[PDB]
Ligand binder design. Sequence first.
Ligand SMILES: Cc1cc(C)nc(Sc2c(F)c(F)c(S(N)(=O)=O)c(F)c2F)n1
Ligand SMILES: [Zn+2]
Length: 257
Amino acid sequence: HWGYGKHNGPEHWHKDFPIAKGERQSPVDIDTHTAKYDPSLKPLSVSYDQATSLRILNNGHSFKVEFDDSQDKAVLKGGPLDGTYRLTQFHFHWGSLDGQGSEHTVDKKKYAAELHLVHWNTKYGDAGKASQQPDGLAVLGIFLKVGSAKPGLQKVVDVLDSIKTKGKSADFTNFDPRGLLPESLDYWTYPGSLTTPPLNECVTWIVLKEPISVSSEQVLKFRKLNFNGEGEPEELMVDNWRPAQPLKNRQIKASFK
Ligand SMILES: Cc1cc(C)nc(Sc2c(F)c(F)c(S(N)(=O)=O)c(F)c2F)n1
Ligand SMILES: [Zn+2]
């Protein structure tokens, strides 16, 4: 089964998921000097005031906070998007040390981690069906750099000890994802894919220019998670990122400069 090791990691994925080598794979390196400023792009509308988190879980690849997406509670619209996208879950990707961990890179720079806020196009009714469509998902990408702590991340970091191993989960209510956003919503955008199997080409990527700062103590708690289930051999969940994939014919658009 797939993972991030030498034997089952990103370079192996195409065998089960041939789209791994397709025309719109993610992540990509964002060449800032090459992105096209599109003055026609709208501001991103992030309406998270009524968000309802439900649970947090370790799925053996990352950890995921799931939201109640059965009504229009936490939605992303505008920017490059047509229509409305509903927040279903967020998760992270991170490194074994601070100099790697992000999936997207900026002028080749790697961040310590990347937050993915995953939304689906309400015209498709469900995240499952949305993932079958070219405009099915919008993922808001946020880079983490190590420095001062992010106070709004703390509630997440404090419960990770309770979901150490694959398949553990816990109730996780009243978490406000607004506490994970940077000041600015300036963004790059491009058409791409899920960054783990099944790698569907269903994602409009929206990657925020401004990183959030998290502390070393916060990221160290991510690195205490395990890929393995309890009573299997210990393997720390670190370096759960896919490297940059070739851009091929695509243009990255910027909302700014
Ligand atoms: C919305 C949906 C539906 C289904 C069936 N699987 C998935 S799995 C998944 C995935 F493979 C991913 F790569 C990502 S990601 N890292 O944000 O691109 C994701 F959010 C995911 F939720 N996601
Ligand atoms: Zn992700």
